[PDB]
């Protein structure tokens, strides 16, 4: 069972703004293969933003992001 | 950034024993609704034993389960 439901993602936090839990939609990078994952909320997804990661990930603007 | 993410899944709980977070391996149903998730811990997946949540109108014995 998903924790928090479908509008609260207690299993990840935004790498750009640090929000936790991710409220709303969640976007997850499929290119960053580091174990920690790379995730962002919608606001940070929609905003042009250079955050390479919060846990020493290597996320480049060419990386692809999908929603869960 | 995913919390846990290795033997700790803060985005899911077992539908069989209600444990949360699922510590250890996590099995997720691929046939149940993408929205309404169905998850199990290792113990509940491997054990052949009735629990009151072992199958429902939504999650049915033909459903397939994958590892995370
Ligand atoms: Zn990335
Ligand atoms: Zn954000
Ligand atoms: Zn199912
Ligand atoms: Zn269980």
């Amino acid at each position: 069972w998903a924790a928090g439901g479908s509008n609260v993602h207690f299993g990840a936090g935004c790498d750009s703004c640090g929000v936790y839990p991710i409220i709303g939609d969640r976007y997850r990078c499929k290119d960053c293969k580091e174990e920690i994952g790379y995730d962002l909320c919608k606001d940070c997804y929609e905003t042009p933003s250079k955050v390479p990661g919060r846990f020493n990930q290597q996320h480049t603007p060419d990386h692809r992001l999908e929603l869960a």
Side-chain angles (χ1 to χ4, degrees), chain A residues 7-65:
Chain A
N7 298 345
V8 180
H9 309 267
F10 279 107
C14 188
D15 285 85
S16 171
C17 67
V19 66
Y20 179 82
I22 292 181
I23 298 95
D25 296 352
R26 154 183 176 209
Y27 292 91
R28 173 168 46 186
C29 172
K30 194 53 203 58
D31 290 0
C32 276
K33 259 65 183 195
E34 292 85 358
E35 193 78 8
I36 313 92
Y38 188 85
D39 310 292
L40 289 187
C41 72
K42 190 163 178 65
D43 285 7
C44 287
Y45 174 78
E46 292 168 352
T47 49
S49 53
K50 283 188 169 186
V51 312
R54 260 178 194 274
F55 288 78
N56 311 337
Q57 303 94 327
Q58 308 201 246
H59 175 84
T60 38
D62 66 328
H63 278 199
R64 308 181 64 184
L65 297 84

